[model samples]
Target: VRSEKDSMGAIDVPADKLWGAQTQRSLEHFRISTEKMPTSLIHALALTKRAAAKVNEDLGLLSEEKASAIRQAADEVLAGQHDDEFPLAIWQTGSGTQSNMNMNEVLANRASELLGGVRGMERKVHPNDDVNKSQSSNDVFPTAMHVAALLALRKQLIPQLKTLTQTLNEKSRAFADIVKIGRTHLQDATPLTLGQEISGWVAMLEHNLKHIEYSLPHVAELALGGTAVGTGLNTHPEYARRVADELAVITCAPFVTAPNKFEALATCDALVQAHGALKGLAASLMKIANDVRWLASGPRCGIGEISIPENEPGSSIMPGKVNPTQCEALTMLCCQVMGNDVAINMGGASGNFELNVFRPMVIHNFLQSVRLLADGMESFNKHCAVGIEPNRERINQLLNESLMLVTALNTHIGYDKAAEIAKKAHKEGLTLKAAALALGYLSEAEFDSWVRPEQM
Candidate 1:
C-alpha cells in the first residue's frame, strides 16, 4: 500500500498484488457500507501473525535469521505501527480472500522492511511465498476471527461487564434501606427496598458474566491448519496444533482446535454461538436499561424511584428538558447485537458446499456486535450504573401507594380474602388498610402491624 493517507486523511494502503489486491477487490465487491473493518478483526489478524511467528520460531520453520525477521516485522505491525496497509474499504467477494491479503500484505511489507528488503520483492523476504507459505483464506480467516474475538472479549468486553456488575453491587449497598414499590403486571403490588431491586440486577449481570466466561473456550478454538476442508491438505498436521499452542501463549488466552476440522472451517456455527452468547447478554442488558428508563421516568409524575444522569437534551422544542439518553444508547446497541445474531444464524445455515462463502459478512457483523456490546456495557456503567442515586422521597411515595400489602393478608385471611381486599381497594380508591378496615375483617391497628414490607 501507499505510505501517505488517502483522500479522507485516512491511512493509505499500497497495492501489493498477492494480498493488497485482494483487499481492494473485497472493498469494491462487498461495498457493504462506509463502516470500516471492526477493530476486533484487526486485532485477530495481529494475533494470528504473532502466533504464527511464535510457532515458526518454536518449530525452526524459518532460518534463525528469517524467524527473527518475521518476529520483528509482525511485532511492529501488531503494535499498530504499520496501519496504512489496513484501509477501510475491502470487498466482500471471495469470502475472506481480501482480509487474508490485507493481513499478508501488511505483515509481509512490514516484515520485509525489518529484514532489510523492500515491501513486495523476495530479495530480503516475501509476503505470499514466505509469510503465507501454507496458509489459506479459509484457515487464516477463521483463526484470526477466533483469536480476535477472544482478545476483544478479554481486553475490552469482559472488563466493561465486570465494571458494570461491580457498580450495581455498590449501588445495591448504597440504596440498601430505601423502600420502593414493586409492580407485577405493570401495576403497583407491594413494597420492596430499592436496594433489593438493585441487588437483583447485580446478581443477574453476575450470572451473565459467568455464562460468557464459560463460552470463551468455544470462542477461542482455532482452525488455522485445517486448510480448505478438514483434509489437512497442503498443510502440516502438527502445524495446526503448534499454531494453536503458540496462539494461546502469544495472545495470553486459551486456544484449541475444533473436534471436527471440516465443520470448523466450512461453517460459521462458532460465530453463531459466540453471537448467541452476546445476544443473551444484550437481552439482559436491554432489560436492565429498560428498567432504568422506567424507574427514572419523571421527577413530577412517573415511578421516579431513581435518577439517571442526564447527558443530552431530550427534544428539539422542549425547553430545560433532559432524557434517559444513556439507557436509550445502551438499548439501541442491544438491538443491534440482537440483529447481528440473526445475521450469524442465517450465515451458518447458508453453507452449501465445503466452504461457507458468506464468511466475510459473518466476520464483519460478528465483530461489530462484539465491539458495540463491549462499548455499550462500558457506557452503561459510566452514564447509568455508577452515578445512580436513590430517590428516597419518591420511592416512599410509590411504596405507600402500592396495593401489594394484600400479600401480607394472604397468610392470615386466606388468598380469597386478600384478593377481595385488593379488588375493593382498587374499586373504591382506598389503600389496602382502608379497604380491609371497612370490611371489618381486620382492625386498623392489626392492618398496620401486619402490612409491613418485610417478614420477620
Candidate 2:
C-alpha cells in the first residue's frame, strides 16, 4: 500500500490502482449501492480532459510537454487501456466530484508516470494544477454528461432506431395487401390492411426520431466554462470555445459553449428534454411489441392472426409451445425506461440555485435509458419483428366472423336499422347478411354489396 495525500492528509491507496486519494476516499466512503458509474460516462470524462489539455496548452495555461502527457494518458483511458481504474459507484455525491476527481487523479498519475515520475504522488503532473486546469467538478461533470449522451445517441441509439424503422417500413409494405380484421377495446371493429396497422408503428418511431433530433441542439451545448457555479472563475475567456472545438474534433459532434453557463449548470433541462424523447420511443416500442405478441397469441386458441419466429422451447412441460420471449424482453425494457424517466424528471427538479446536485443520477438514468432502448429495439427488430408472418387462414376466418362489417350498413339502411341488425346478429349467432335478411332490412344482394370487408 502507498500513502497518497490530498488536503485531508495521508490515506492508504493500493499501489496497483492508478487513482489517488480522492478516488480511494470515494470507494470506501460511499458503499450505498453496488452500482458502479457507467463506463460510457468514464469515457466521456476522458474525452473532456483530453480536450481541456489541448485547450489549456493552446491558451498557454499549461506547457506543451505537460499537456501532451496529460492528453496521452486520457487517450489511453479512452482506448480502454485503463478500464478498471475507475471504481466509484453511481450513487456518490450528486455533483459527481469524486468521479470527476477519479478521472483527474488517474490521468494525473498516468501522466506522472509517462513523465518518468512515480505513480502514487502527483508531482510532475499534479491532478488539480496541471491536469484539471481551468475546470471544476461541477462544470466538468456536467460537460461530460452532455458529451456522453450526444455520442451515445449518435453512435448507439440513432442507428438502432433507424434500422428498426427500416425493418418495420419493409414489413408495412410487405403486408400492405393482406386485409385483416381490426380491433378496438379488444372487440372486433371494421377492416384495415395489415400494412396500414404496421405503418402506425413505423410513424411512431419516425416521430420519436424527430423529437430526439429536435432536442439534440440543446444537449450539444457544453458546460465546461461554467467553472464552480456558473461564474467562469479562474478560466481563460477562450477556454470554453477552444475546448468545445477540440471535443468536436475528437468526437465528431457539434458541441458548443453554452451561451448561458448559469442555465447549463443550474438545470439539466436539455437532458430532461432528450430523455423525454427517449420515453416517447419506449412507449411506441411497448405498443408495437404488445401488439405483435397479442397478434401472434396462439396458433389454435387465442387471436391467431399472425405468427412470430419460434426461437426456443417455451415451457418446461408443454411439448410444442413457443412464447413471444423477444416481445416480453422489450416490454420489460420499456417499463424500465419509464421508471428512469420519472427519476430523471425528479433529478432535473432537484437542481438548486447554482448547481444541480443530482448530476450523476440524472445522467446515469439518461444514458441508461438510451442504452436500454437502443439495444432492446435492436433485439426486437432482429428476432421478433423481422420474423412476423400473417396467418392468412386465421385472418380470413376472423374477418368472416366479425359483426362490425355492419358498420357499412349504417350509410345504406339508416343508423337505427343498422344497429338492430348488428344486435340481432350478436344475440342469435347469425351472420350480418342473415340478420339483415331475417329483419327484412335489405335484399340478399343489397346486404352482400354493403357488408363486403373490402368495401368497409
Candidate 3:
C-alpha cells in the first residue's frame, strides 16, 4: 500500500490503484451493494473533465502544460483506458462526491505522471486545484447524469422501440381484412378487423415515443457551471458557456448550459419527467403483452384464436404443454419498471433545497428501466409477435355465433323491438331470424337483409 492525503490527512491505498485518499476513504466506508457506477456515467464524467480543461485553457485560467495533461488524461479515461479504476459504489454520498473525486484523483495522478511527476505526490498537478478547477461534484455529477441518460435513451432505447413499432405496424396491415369479434368487459360487444386491434397496440407505443422525445430538451440542459451550489463562484465569467459549447462539439450532441443553474443543480425534475415517460411506455407494454397472451390463451379450451410460438415446454409434470413465456417475462419486467418509477418519484420529491440527495438513486433506476424496457420490447417482438398466427377457424366460429349481430338490426327495427327479439332468441334457443319472424318484428327478407355480420 501507498500513502495519500486529502484535507483530512493521509490514508493507505492500494499501490496499484490510480485513485487518491478521498477515493480510498469512500471505498472503505460505503461498501453497500454489488452496484458499481455504470461505465456510461464514468465516460460522461470524463467528457466534462476534458471540456472543462479546454475551456480553462482558452480563458487563460490554466497553464498550457496542466490543461493539455488533464485533457489527454481525460481522453484516455473516456476511451476506456481505466475502466477498473472507477470502483465506487452507487450508494455513496447523495451528491456523488466520491465518484467525482474518484475521477479527479485518477486524472490528476495520471496527468501528473504524464508531466514527469509521480502519483499521489500532488507535485506537478493537484487533484482539487488543477484537475477539479472551477468545478464541484454537485454540478458535475448531475450534468454527467443527464448527458449519459440522453445518450442511452437515443442510442440504446429509441432504436429498439422504433423497430418493434414498425414490426407491429406491418402485422396490423397484414391482418387488416380478418374481421373478428371484439370484446369489452370480457364479453362480446361488436365486430372489428384484427388489424384494428393490433393498430391500437402500435399507436400506444407511437405516443409513448413522443412522450420521451418531448422530455429530451429539458434533459439536455446541463448543470456544469453551477459550481458548489448555483452561483458559478470563483470561476471565469465565460467558463460555463465555453465549456458547454466545447462539450457539445466534442460529443456531437445538442448540449447547452442551463439558464438557471440554481434549479439545474437543486432538483432533477427533468429526470423525473423523462422517467415518467418511461413508466408510460411500461404501462403500454404490459397491456400489449397481456392482450397477446389473452388472445393466445389456450390451444384447446380458452380463446385459442391465436397461437404463439411454443418456445419451450412450460410444465414438467404435465406433458407437451407450452406457455406464453415471453409475455410473462415482459409483463414481469413492466411491473419492475412501474415499481422503479415509484422509487424515482420518492427520490425526486426528497430533494430539499439546492441539492437533491437522491441523485444516484434516480439515475440508477432510470437507466435500468431504459435498458430493460428496450430489451423487453425487442424480445417480445421477435419471440412472440413475429411468430403469432391466427386460428382462422376459431375466429370464424366465434364471429358467426356471437349474438351481438342483433345490433345490426337495431337501425332497421326500433331498439326496443330488436332487444325483444334478441331476448326471445336467447331464451328460446333459436336464431335471431327465427325469433324475429315468429315475434312478427320483421319478415325473413328484412331479417336476412339487415342482420349481416360483415355490415355490422
Candidate 4:
C-alpha cells in the first residue's frame, strides 16, 4: 500500500512480499535522514551504466539494435541526464545494495523505455538478469570509489597542491637573504635564512606530492573485473577487459583489472594503504601549518616573525584578536585524516567471509578524507601561504640572540676556544664577537668577518 504522487506523477513502492522482510525492515527501521542520497554516486551510476552497456555488447546478450539503444540511454545518463534517478532515500548501510538496486532499476527502466517497453517493468530489460548481469554492489561500489578518487585527485587535488608548492618556492627565493634565529626543541639553536625555512616547507610539500603521485597509480588499478567476490564466475571471459576499456575511454583514465579478484573483493586494504598515504600527506601539511602559525603567533608577545592574512574574526569576544585560524583548520583536517585511517583499518579488518561488510563506510570515509585534504590544501595556500609577510627586523634580532654563532667561531679558531668564548658570552650577556674579542681568539675584524650573522 505504498503509493505517492509528485512532479513525476503517481508512483508505487510495490510491497512485494517476496523481496525479503529483512530488506523491508531496513527500508523502514533506520530512517535516519531523508537526505540519504549521495551527490557523487553519480560517478558510480555513470560508470555502471557504461560498463553494463559494454558488457551487453561484448556478451552478444542483446541484438545490435537493442545494444545500440541501451548504449544511447546509458550515454545520456552518463552525460548528465537522468540525474534525478538517484533518489535520496537509501541507507548508507544497506551495504550499497539498495544503491545497486537503484542503478539497476534506473538503467533497466530507461533502456526499456528507449525500446518502447513498459516503464519500471523488470521483465523487459531485466534489472537483475540483463542489467546487473554478472556483478554485485560489493565489488562495484569499491571500483567506483577508486575511479572517483582518482578523478578527484587528478583534476582537483594535484593542481591546487602544485599552486601551493610554487607559491612556497617563490616565497623561498624572496626570503633567501633574511637571516633568522632557528630553534631546536623550543630553544635557540642556530642561525638560518628565512628563505631556508620556506624552502623546507616547499620540500615537505614536494615529498608529499611524490607520495600522492605514487599512490595514484594503485588507485587507478581498479577492481571492476572482480565481479561478485572477484571470482567472475558468471561473468564472461571478455567482460572484465571490455568494462575496463569502456571506463578508461569515458574517464580518459587508465583503468586496469585487478590481478587478484578474490583479494580485491574480500579486503579493504587498498583503501587502508591509500588512506595512509593521505594521513602521511596530512602530517606533512600539519607541520607546515603549525610551523607557519607559530612563526606568526604574536606581533607583540609571541614569536611574531611573519604575518598570516586573517580570514575571519578569530575570537568572538576579544577585541582586535585574530587567531591562527588557518592552522586550526589544517590541524583539524589532519585529525580527520587520522580518524579516517582508523576507520579504514577497522573496515579492512571487519571484512569477513567472502565480503567486506563495511564497504559503504569505507568508501564514504575514504572519499571524505580525500575531499578534506584537497580542500584543505587549497585553503592553506589561499588563506595562509599567499600574502604571508616576514618580519625582517625580528628575524635579525632573534638571530643575534642565539649563541650558535660559536660554531662559526670554531670554524676559524677551534672547538675548545669557541666553547670558552660561548660560555663567556652567555655569562656576560655580550655578543659572541665581543666574547671572542675578549678571549683574543682572533681580532675583532676577523671575528666580524668570520662569525658575523651573515657568515653563520
In candidate 4, which residue ranges exceed 4 Å CA deviation? 1-26, 33-38, 63-95, 111-125, 313-321, 409-447
lDDT of 1 by residue, 151-229 (tens): 8878888898888888889888988777677778997655777788888888888888888888887777788888777
**Which ranges in model 1 have alpha carbons more than 4 Å from their true place?**
1-32, 57-61, 88-91, 120-123, 313-321, 406-447
Worst 10 residues of 2 by lDDT: 313-322
Per lDDT, the best of the predicted structures is 2
lDDT for each candidate structure: 0.74, 0.89, 0.89, 0.73
lDDT of 4 by residue, 284-351 (tens): 88888989889987767889898878778556676535588878988998999888888789888887
> Which pairs clash inside model 3?
none
Stretches of model 2 off by over 4 angstroms after superposition = 315-320, 407-424, 433-450
Cα displacement (Å) at residue 114, model 4: 4.8
Model 2 per-residue lDDT tens digits across residues 1-456? 989989988899888888999888888889886777788999999999999999998888899989999999998998899999988998999899999899988999999889898788645889988778899998999999999999999999999999999999999999998889888988877789999999999999999998889999999999999899888988888888889999999999999999999999999999999988898888889999999999988767899888888888567677436699999999999999999999999999888899889988898889899999989988888888888899999998888787878778888877888999889998999988788889998898887787767664
Clashing pairs in 2: none
Give the CA lDDT, 0 to 100, for residue 300 in model 1.
72
Score every model by TM-score. 0.85, 0.93, 0.90, 0.84
- What TM-score number comes out for model 3? 0.90
The true-structure Cα RMSD of candidate 3 reads 3.0
lDDT of 4: 0.73
Better of 2 and 3 by TM-score: 2
Clashes of each: 11, 0, 0, 0
lDDT digits (tens) for residues 38-125 of candidate 3? 8889988999899999998888888999999999999899888999899899999999888999999999999999999988765588
